[model samples]
Target chain A: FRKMAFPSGKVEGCMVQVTCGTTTLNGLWLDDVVYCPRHVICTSEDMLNPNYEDLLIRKSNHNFLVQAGNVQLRVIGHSMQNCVLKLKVDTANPKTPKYKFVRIQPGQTFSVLACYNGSPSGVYQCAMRHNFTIKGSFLNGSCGSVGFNIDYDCVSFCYMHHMELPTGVHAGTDLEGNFYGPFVDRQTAQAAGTDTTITVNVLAWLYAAVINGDRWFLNRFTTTLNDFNLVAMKYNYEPLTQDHVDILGPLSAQTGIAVLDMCASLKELLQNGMNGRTILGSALLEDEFTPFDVVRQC
Target chain B: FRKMAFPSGKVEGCMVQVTCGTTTLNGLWLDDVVYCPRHVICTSEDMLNPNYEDLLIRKSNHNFLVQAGNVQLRVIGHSMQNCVLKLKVDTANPKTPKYKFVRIQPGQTFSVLACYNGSPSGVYQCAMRHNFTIKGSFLNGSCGSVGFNIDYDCVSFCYMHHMELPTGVHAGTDLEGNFYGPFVDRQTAQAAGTDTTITVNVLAWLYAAVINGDRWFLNRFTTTLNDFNLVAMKYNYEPLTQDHVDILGPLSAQTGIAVLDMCASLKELLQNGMNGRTILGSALLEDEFTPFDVVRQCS
Candidate 1:
């Protein structure tokens, strides 16, 4: 079967990084991650575990685990076109080989394409980064540029997440990248709002009949909010306030860290909750990652 | 400034009428009643009066006294080619000529159609069937067929009422204008139930919350039924048998209706000291309407 591939075309020479958390640490790099497209399953709620484990196995030198779906890739690098193209999958585990290198032709752009065979209902993290093999300076090494994009094809639906920096291409040293800008500063908050939040708010509104009422909220939190004492009380007291800096502190400091905290809290609190209802409601929160009422502050 | 012309169509033929119950009626025929369009502020749940004397001058005559919102017409007639329609608004009195006849055409339908230019909202009714016309049958004579299809565009939104019927086009006619069916002989009973004794059973397994002894059915008719010497009691009574019916009399009919009658009797005794609830609940058994549950054997 022809693989379905998600490709990113170079949109003006610019540097871009798809990091999980606030900082661009080793485990934070999107390329160092390997996601299992086969073991991917879609549930009404978003979850991280076996899927993350599958990625961990693939990143751990188990290239066989990296089953390709219907997808192909083509890369385009400028000036130093001779530089190797690398794809990495970091399953959050560090003791694994999380990188792959491919070559791209000079002066000609490339593409990665794939077509999935089965019903698409899985999540994956993929990135196309510039391999530092061929030494070159574009914005000088400190601000090396890498083009990346992710295409999610599940069932009959398809979505693309592309990153291109035309004007604000990172400029500095190649080895160390700093998080200091609208993007980084914005990530540091009690809640992050975006299109996801808008969609979540709509879902929440649609399910308002099932979610509202003081008793329902209390019962839900008692069973679904992980570390009920930690974030529940704090979240309840502050609601959507930024006072719980302690909760978001350890999260925003590291890459892939905030999501980890979110997952841990969700899993524990959701243990005793209603089967599909709580999960679906919690997903509305995760998908939007912000309070419905507080989405306009941005 | 170009003045907006009143929307008027020229249909080959049309008429109107009004009615008061089944018998007493006057005015045009039902077929002649013109279809009123939206912007036509007619249907209001108010009593209709036709006499010019009692007519409320503030209220427009052509205004419909029915439910508001989307309204339409069902015209059932023949050769409605070109016709002028008029209306007489006072339904209760019937002496006023509220609207003048105007023509509607073949292909064109009236709409937020201009009725009274000065009044922005159109309020006019087609002169349709009048009861006298049906009994009298002629002035222009009754149309060969009496059926109606909504001709106005806005009528599409009229509320649909669910009905049960055996097929065939019903132009307000009996099943087939043919075939005869038997009417079984019936009788009425004098007692609320046999011997004035009644048993009420609340069904189990429905829901616990609903099975409470809150006296739901009894409170409605306490005193009236009791005055007739009918007693209300709730207990598990033996299923009605030939022997049981012999002793209990008419109340042994249907479980629900029987129980309801008993409850009504007891309620009446508590209230008016009359058997009105018992009589109504059991469907006026003193008359020949047989309760579906029981049938008297002919000797």
Candidate 2:
């Protein structure tokens, strides 16, 4: 079996045909996945002196090559995956193509040139397994591994958060050599409470993500907001104003969040009363956290 | 001047004319009624010998006559009131047509042949004066003068009750020679309690009368029903049924009677517990009556 992975972005209407013995079969390639028609298993010894000749592989609208010798073939296209090719003739003919097609029966060995797992599967799977950690900056040396990460600064947080990096992308530095950091200033932290427009917009987007059942969007926005709230709490930021309560009150009702753990977070924010003041006094005001935020902090 | 009272029934298009001097004026005659066009008063001496040459009186479609010295007049049709004719000149000339018209100036006295008060002014006006009496009888007596009368027999009661008589015709007896007698029998009285159909029908009519604002109909039905209940009480009749209660319950509501003295009547009946027996024993039943009936029974 030969398996080839493609960038979900690049694989579009890609067609693959295999020629073995006297039969030629066709299959479709798409979106980080490929499948060729079923064929019989062949031995490596059979590949040395294949029964078929002039086996060519073609990708419509792109140049590809297959050199057949000793029943092994060197294959080329925009890329390759899990297959090999060998030349039969001694003299290299750069201009003349020996075969315009490639064939492989079952049990053939092949390799891919650029195969990337560009899918939400890894991110979501890791999320379910709780294998990834949210590396927090400013509070501790290593915030430790979590299912998701939360960034502090609006700029960096929104940048990486919107990029939708796959699960393991957090293990190393991004392309910019920048590591994940949970950073927030007094202005940013205060805005999360005082700026009605920003909070409302964020809530609108968050509600839309929830409504669409887009798990990826939900995972990032929820995790990011949880972290943002934590950092704001750590600095003893201003309590969320009446405007936040007003927007979130109806939003909670609409999304059925009033019955969920998120409801506790809302209750804490609103306990000061919908009109004015924070629920907690100066002594009680500490690094208040939601259940979701607790998981990220851990 | 002359006035004629025709039988209220007889006068449909009765025409009357009078002659005084040379002119004859025509007029309609009706009611226990009178009509005279504006006129000047003439002396009796002038009437004995009119200033105008000829005087005549004519009742259209009938022959009547009166003669003055210079003018002779004739009258026709039925009845007159308020004046008499004194024959001053006469010559028996049955075949000779002396005059075809009758006339009179104001203040000349004349007579109507049959002018009698056939109106209900006595019955109704006396009712307003509180001068009349309501007389009761088993079938027929002088059921007396009244604005209306309640009947005792259910058949006769329902018969005339449903008849819907118009106002102001009690001066004489009805065509059957029977006057209004408020009567209700023992069986009919019992049925008002036990029979839902009769009670509902009575209530339905009562409601319609109330809704129509027909005071006469309301007075009679209510008084008659009240009297029926009283008679039933005197006899220790069976209690009204639940059906009676149920029907009368809504009836009282619609009529604003549930809150009234009549409501006491209904409560009294229902208190007997309907169906078969009286809630209160023989010691309890008495001359129970509605205020409406009290007023009706009095003069």
Candidate 3:
């Protein structure tokens, strides 16, 4: 997949170290994390784990787990089953793209990165210090998820999470590398006095996009290999393992379509809700996470 | 103001209580709780709180909270800070409607009803036993959210919770008083081999409803008095204590409009999103909830 074009203007530098807790450490913006892609970004709900720190000293580097204090700083792309996979940081020059590196920093605070084994991951520049959180001259390190405070230019629309792409109103980010939005709640948005807004439902907006004949933008996000939306599939609809493997797996592979792909059989399978009472086109999503049904606007 | 005319039938019976845990004790269907209006219903997340049980033993009834063993059977419409509300159970005959009464039963299992002080509320029917959970012979108590396991009739729309009414195709319930729908998730709804559906967005549907101009149904639901939708109001949109009192309160009193009332200024207020990039009607509710911007649909 191609990289996002937002949050520009930074020299391609490698590894930094520092303390943790910036902007209370929300989810990291995939674009800001030098190397982490949308699929592999980690979400640490702004809390600390003692074990995560210990693991950093023990196994964070490729082969230098024994070098105690010199914790190798590696931004992880993904992790699972006792393994924090190494991520390839993009280089300054596009030609030298995707560089793989791990650095060693000494300090309890600088241990932001996690060990490949059971260690937890911390932010190097937690939206706090001006300089990167890691390899710092004091002001740098964990890049706390660059958060924005939106009150002025606020309106309503189906929104993506912090890591979500710049769809709809969030088509651009500010010079500070923050998406124009600091997407808050619907009621909260409208209270901005100058809001001029009402939040729209994400699924509802997808319908509008499909109607607008702008499915290309949506074609960018397909379900990830690991997150097949099995949770979404099981809410009211039953998943046919083979059907997902047979239908969803390939169609997404071929078209890059989202939750509303023709293969989704939304029209056929959704008919069972409310015992045949729920109308396909007019049904509303209640209580559960609506599929990340993405579709671009015209 | 008008009771939902969806789940029909059943003679107007007084109070009945039984053991807890029906449909595993999801939120109660407001309409089913006799007199528990939309605003007064209680929501217990399918778990039992012993303190809730003890409080029921001490203070559930309007007057007699001291029956150690015999539990007072009363349908609480609402509770808060430190009080469980007493609901008037409707009588079979409308002439003497809204009867107020509380019964007493002797059984730990029959302590589904919570107390006015601190006891928790359990199901009356529990979607399990019959003959009511209280004042029962055996099979009854806590009408567990009257759940329906849906497979055939599925589709997507911005759905209301189980207690929500018969909007859209849910215009009617079955002979057993179940709304035709047993709403489920979209991805999950699709697996119903025979499903001919697609989940539509609720707020989006509201937009369509506005276009269709069938908003009378939406007028049925407005923010309640106690449970002011401060949460929905705070999401992305700001709530002006004055604005709510100034804009939302009176407007609802006057017209009973939903989340999309003109006073809501959706068109005007919703324009600032994404620095004017997010179009109002087209804006999507990302994480926080979209307003219950209800609107009726028509061809």
Candidate 4:
């Protein structure tokens, strides 16, 4: 899990998906920085929110490097997938860490307005892209090396106009300014019960291996190792076994669903195909080449 | 093709996969810089060769920068799968332009000895890893941004001890000093004919897209978009016509087999399964998740 901060742009909050003026404004103040349905925005309204009451915009919009002292980046896991990264705006709360991170890909963008003396320092803030550009020789590339590109809409938003709390729609976040959310749909809320459930299906890919220069990837359907089914190819295999599989539940499924940094499309495969019924993360099986992003717990 | 060069180390020749003492010495001076199997070595024998005879070593092993004034890097494709990268040690045989590149992943390593005054400046040279570290803000990231890692042995070697030159094994290379080669086996060389075939089956993955947060990856056996086979899911997909398929050849399969620049496991799926029987690159269609690295020219 490489922990990287976007360019040191401090901000009140951002409005997502707007070309220039319009934005869904889905306020993304998360718990520990995790949010729903990908990295969407908080609200188009800079300073107002119905539930949180003017929590989106802090008092300042000045230029102070959120660097040298403001931001902190850290990893959360030991897997090869590298745990997902999360970041927060330090609002002097100091004791209780308020915000959390949503799963933002390497090239995603966001906006930030800086601060000084608890006052809006006459500076206007626009959203900036969260680029994963490595600085220095990649020899310095450890966490900076710990990121990947995504193939999804990968946008976020925060809205303030008319607040209607659908069972699925997240009605702005709380004082901590963690990401706000909207359930992917009414059904997902019912299935998981608005339970601060996984913010989004952070996508990642399955593994692939080659044998003796031959392709031997771990795929879903056909469930056979491609040419290994041939005469000269080695075909013996081993299964994870039903018993040992139980332990996986308390693992990634329980703690870091959004944090799996590698596989994305496969993520929706297991979550969508499973439809959230399984007590643990459900393992997927299909033909052609289905992605196996998550591991089932129970 | 993010054409990157190893840290400007120009040497007489390199011995692959050695632990400081020995090398296979399968001289990897290639044609247009392409070679066989994965990026394996030519020979351990520096300055010595069997078939090519005395082609490995030049005059110097000094501190010369194969830098700005020396090497050239360029792209060959516009596909998401950028063409593979290639580099050569310029012996000033310039004008004739005699060298090429092999598929070296971003973090791989190699050896080089530099030169100056056409003389060894007495600078000792060992192997340096081909790191794909992005320099600048990545605002400058064009080719520096174009590379990926592999899950294979990813090692190369050039053997000098014995020159059996089995049909699969590459006998050291000719002058011009491109990469040296060895086929994967007697079977592949026989199937494809020892003609200057693809040095290795460069691997790249099929595409995957998400529809409304659900994974809709391109798969093989099941063939249907995953979960797209569900209710409230759109499932109509059109197949490429047979005629359009012909155009793909004379395309990648012809010009850039070794230059695919992405997808390794799937590369073997097509080549190994096809077994060289097809005239064009083979398209893999399977289930349990197969890697689709290459396209088939023929049905």
Candidate 5:
């Protein structure tokens, strides 16, 4: 068991003396400190009694610092479920010892509160979470590097939404925190960026696969890109929307014979209800066929 | 969402002026003057990724007193498990808007670190632990008292082994941090004085229940205390053993009952192989005798 005290605040140059006690390994000094500005608390036992009297509060900060000077820990029997770490904080009185049930997943580090008077104080034990139930060769006998995974999905929805977009655009859109699709303009699209690229792509593909006819693509492309065409035969021609025409003013424009033909083929595939995976794959190939020479002719 | 910035080594007065663009919470003051000492670095996020940092470390203790700030708080769902409070810190950007989770249990008061960043700071939200899931009526909250009971038997065997004896005689006999029994000696008992009535009761009860047998009563009344012994012509005398003898030393010396004899009629029942409980209501009297005490008198 290790013993230490919290800084009394009066000490200007007082160093915290960490007596590691008599253990198999050598003890050393501790020098790092971080104040927890925001806190997340967890407990390993059943919160059957709603009152906080019996519950154990496990607080972790953003940087994964378990508070220092809390409890003392030792490893006992090891079996299958021994992967879980069991800690008993020995208060001077033995009748009630504060215990912590912990499972430290990979990439996570945990420290315990040294429980005294049924309350925990500074750094205690660190062990693998799964080691509590089952034991194996992995019980290395001392505190070592621990790790954990922070699932972005588990973060607050608002936090995730902010991550996908710049702060201003997120507020302007008034989007639900979990909404991650159908970016309308360049500003919104650029705001969302590639952080949510997979989510957007999947929705886009699903939309194409479900659209009733090839007309869906034509309408979207013309309205968004400000261009248009009409099918005049196996050949095609069309009037541009008046707003679109005004933007171009008198610049010559025409749909290509080859471009019109390709639309007809895509129309057939879209109307038959092809899956998104297949349709998206085919659409990429068609994108390379855009007639770059048409604008020069006009 | 309340945000404040401090430069190294500059101590901001207790009541400092804070600006969030055009709007401010005005003359916000802090109750306690907390020091952010030297060599100690504070940052908005983890130092590994310093982008968008909230509060960076400098050389001075600048107290950001949060008497009141522009930050607004919204409670979505209650945090039932961690008592009545929940505070979630930002794990995404390790910069300026970072927070750490904090909770306060019932009957306890807590201090918080609140500051604001961004436009006018009025749009701020204070991150906290969720509250109670089911809020009881004002009448149904805590009773303002805590009660716990440790049964003597369960505690003695389980966690009470290390309890200190009453007097200073055994103080030198303790084995470092190990547990010792509730065993009492005369010297320890006498040291307690008359004021220690409760301590004496516990000592006497433990002695009768665990150490000496109940035969001392037979010597006093010339018969056993029982309904069957009233109309019956016989009684049983019980002798003591090495275990009984060892425990009876102090009691017999103090009580004046040296040798106890069985009331003749009760001896035949013992020889007939009928146990003492069979004659009485076994359910009611099982605690009165143990077989360990019966045959041990022969040796």
Candidate 6:
């Protein structure tokens, strides 16, 4: 007979052995599943509890699982409706890191990953909002309901993905009185194949266009490019040479191309009515997403 | 009898020759003073007429006179109240020149002077808004009132002094599309003992401060002046030497001084409600001026 060990450590079935002519096969049969010692069985009372540390597990219709890896938290949504979950690390600590909103559709699972400054403890607390109608089978037949026309109106749900940082690599303030860091360095970004130079250049161009009211690049497609050499020299604060103009010519053309591409992407999102999908860090769905979904994600 | 010649070819008063102990004396006696032919006797209808060419003369109870000279039209405001008058020349013509508002306070007389391209006919229209209560005598006894309180309320007169040019010296637009005047030349401005250089520099500085937001001269008193040498050089488009700064220094100081003086004058006008006086071309009075008086003066 072969033994299968469940992570929950509690097993309710017996291991049976079947003998063939020359081989023996082992099979396990389960009658019922019980909560493991580590599993905190959540109830409606836990939701109303004033102490957050006591509120550890979140109950749903399906027997889903929560797995805490080295630096990530994996949550499986097994309910018939969408589930929005919040995972908080170091539940009793004031400086605990929290990923407040994580949306998962039915039968789908999501994994949270981030860079942390400190080592994370393998324990975490979860709260979940189940998007289901009370008039239908509640909690996947776990809860019985009286015959009534009452809608649960599951409004306490978020529709966003979130990530949290560990305490080891906390951010520090910069010379400009801005908090920055806990970020990969330039070499690290390069090793990760991120275009750092292009990103910085794009940001600089964006500020120039917005702050200085540089319409030459915005209306570049319609208007003829003239006096750009003079403009480039004025902004760059250097003498305009033939080589500089040659470099500026291509860079100026890219701004118009980037704007058109961005406009196309924005137009697509507006046309889709923001349903059943996630775009630009937002999951837009009916009945599952709350108004606070956008802010909660940030 | 001694005879005296009258320009109108008509005489009402007779001059008599008298003798007293071989000393002869000539005395003139008059029953009434009749207007000469040149005297355009104004009536109340003349003040109300819109056909300005036909409107003539302005009379006051104080026996003031109107003299139409070659280049000037003088009106003596001899009444007890201020007389605001309007003098419109060639009013029926399309290019009629008009000075619509002239505020002549009581005991004050104003003259309208001009540089006419052509010789003037020395004949013009006269209109006046007599600041008097209608319950008493109206229109200086020319228009007697009944038992009514009609204020006339002529307060539409403008507070600005105006001068017009004849068509002969028609101004041509400059390259900047602005009309340069048929004004006196630079030599004339200099000969009049007017400091044209200082006037032009002051005008330039005023425009720079107001238009370009030049804070150099405005804040020079508070802040130490250092970069002004460069500023002057930049504006003059020349090299700044010590000789240039000597000239620029005094001119720059004058800008600040003039601004303070102008501010003081404006403060005085604001502090005193411009009462019983004209300040910056506006006549302010207590209960004596009305909004309609200005317009009636124009009419």
lDDT digits (tens) for residues A1-298 of candidate 6: 0000001101101112211122222211122211111112233343223232333234442333322222222222221111112222221222112212222221111111111111110110111212111111111111100110101211111111111122111111111112122222111211111111111122223323333343322322221123332332333322223432343343345444443332233233334443454322223211221112211111
* TM-score for each model: 0.16, 0.14, 0.22, 0.20, 0.15, 0.13
Model 1: docking quality category:
incorrect
TM-score of 3: 0.22
lDDT tens digits, residue span A1-298, model 1: 0011121111111112222212111111233432211212212132222343333333322222221222221112101111111234333222222222223211111111111221111111111112111111122111123222222211111111111132212211111222111222111122211111122222222233223221132222122223433443333211222223233333234322332343333434344443435432232232212221111111
The candidate scoring highest on TM-score is: 3
| Global lDDT scores for all candidate models | 0.21, 0.24, 0.23, 0.21, 0.20, 0.21
Worst ten in a row by lDDT for model 1 chain B: B128-137
Expressed as tens digits, the lDDT of each residue in A1-298 for candidate 5 is 0111111111111111111111111111112221110101112222112222221133112212221233332212211111111122112222111222122221111222211111111111122111111011111111211111112112110111111223212211111111223332122234333221111112222233333232233322212222213221122222223342232222212222123233343344334444443443243222101111111111
Candidate 3's residue-wise lDDT over A141-239, tens digit each? 112222111111121111111222112111112222222233221112211111211011223333443453534323222343233344334443232
Candidate 2 lDDT tens digits, B15-51: 2333334323322222212122111112334433333
Superior by lDDT: candidate 2 or candidate 3: 2
Candidate 5 TM-score versus the reference: 0.15
Q: What share of the true interface contacts does each candidate keep?
A: 0.00, 0.00, 0.00, 0.00, 0.00, 0.00
Candidate DockQ scores, in order: 0.01, 0.00, 0.01, 0.01, 0.01, 0.00
Off by over 4 Å in 5: A1-197, A200-298, B1-22, B25-299
**Which segments of candidate 2 are over 4 A away from where they belong?**
A1-298, B1-172, B175-251, B255-299
Best of the candidates, lDDT: 2
What are the per-residue Cα lDDT tens digits for candidate 5 across B92-188?
Answer: 1111111122222211111111112210110000111112111111111111101111122110001101012333211100111121222321122
Off by over 4 Å in 6: A1-225, A228-298, B1-215, B218-299
Q: What tens digits encode model 4's per-residue C-alpha lDDT throughout A1-298?
A: 1011121111222211111122211222222232111111223343132222222232122211122122321212111111111223333222222232344321122222112211111111111111111111111001111111112212223111112132212121222222223322111112212121111122211221111121122233322222212311211111222322232233335333322221232333433454423211212221111112222100
lDDT of 1 at B35: 29
